[PDB]
Design a protein around this ligand. Structure first.
Ligand code: YCH
Length: 261
């Protein structure tokens, strides 16, 4: 199809490996490019950790207000929000927001701890029907993005379906789903990625990811004005360990998808 030829050309021009999955919820049609190949999730995995904590809060009603101490030893490589609260506390809600909207790695590690380890995050994925997602490591080593390594990967198809279920479906309770949507819509790290290839009038909620091998990812829910929402996952990785990020590729892939609608 036209869109798949344009995505292939974009990939060829980029020098890397591009994975795309689009779900149009109007007719549940899907557009896939390398949709069943594994890609390193990097920080896109933070959505799953936050959603797992939200699921816990359906039974533990006060869980998100639980204070969690941030100690100096907790700080890792990228902690824009946690750094502001060293030797103090953040609630689980604040940690979830930080992980999602600022991609805070300390916050992610606290979420993982709350879930009983990476296996607890993976288990949540399995519980909502995602057989592909696997989280194996904590921050920052889950971002190594080594070619061929299946750790800390998923496929575009799987992540699109899971993101749909979490945000537009009913994998979470009503208050929890709404909270997740609010968090994603307030992301601060996404301006140069999917959002940049879409009409400025569309509302987007997204989570970016970055890692070694120039890995540059973004997963989004998109609410076009007067039109069913769309779920779009764009994963990109490159052959050189020290390659630069290529957010423009994700913007271009989004633009190509948007043109075909
Ligand atoms: B994710 O991918 O977003 C930023 C941080 C950097 O380690 O991880």
């Amino acid at each position: 199809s036209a869109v798949q030829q344009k995505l292939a050309a974009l990939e060829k021009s980029s020098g890397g490996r591009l994975g795309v999955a689009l779900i149009d919820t109007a007719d549940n049609t899907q557009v896939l490019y390398r949709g069943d190949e594994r890609f390193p999730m990097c920080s896109t995995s933070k959505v799953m950790a936050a959603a797992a904590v939200l699921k816990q809060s359906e039974t533990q009603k006060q869980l998100l207000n639980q204070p969690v101490e941030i100690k100096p030893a907790d700080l890792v490589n990228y902690n824009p929000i946690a750094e502001k609260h060293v030797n103090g506390t953040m609630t689980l809600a604040e940690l979830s927001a930080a992980a999602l909207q600022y991609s805070d790695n300390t916050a992610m590690n606290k979420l993982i701890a709350q879930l009983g380890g990476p296996g607890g995050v993976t288990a949540f994925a399995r519980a909502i029907g995602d057989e592909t997602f696997r989280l194996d490591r904590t921050e920052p080593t889950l971002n190594t993005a080594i070619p061929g390594d299946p750790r800390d990967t998923t496929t575009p198809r799987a992540m699109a379906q899971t993101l749909r279920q979490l945000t537009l479906g009913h994998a979470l309770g009503e208050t929890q789903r709404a909270q997740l949507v609010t968090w994603l819509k307030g992301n601060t790290t996404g301006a140069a990625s999917i959002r940049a290839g879409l009409p400025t009038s569309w509302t987007v909620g997204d989570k970016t990811g970055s890692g070694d091998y120039g890995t540059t990812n973004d997963i989004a829910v998109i609410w076009p004005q007067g039109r069913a929402p769309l779920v779009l996952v764009t994963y990109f990785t490159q052959p050189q360990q020290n390659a630069e990020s290529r957010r423009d590729v994700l913007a271009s892939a989004a633009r190509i998808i948007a043109e075909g609608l």
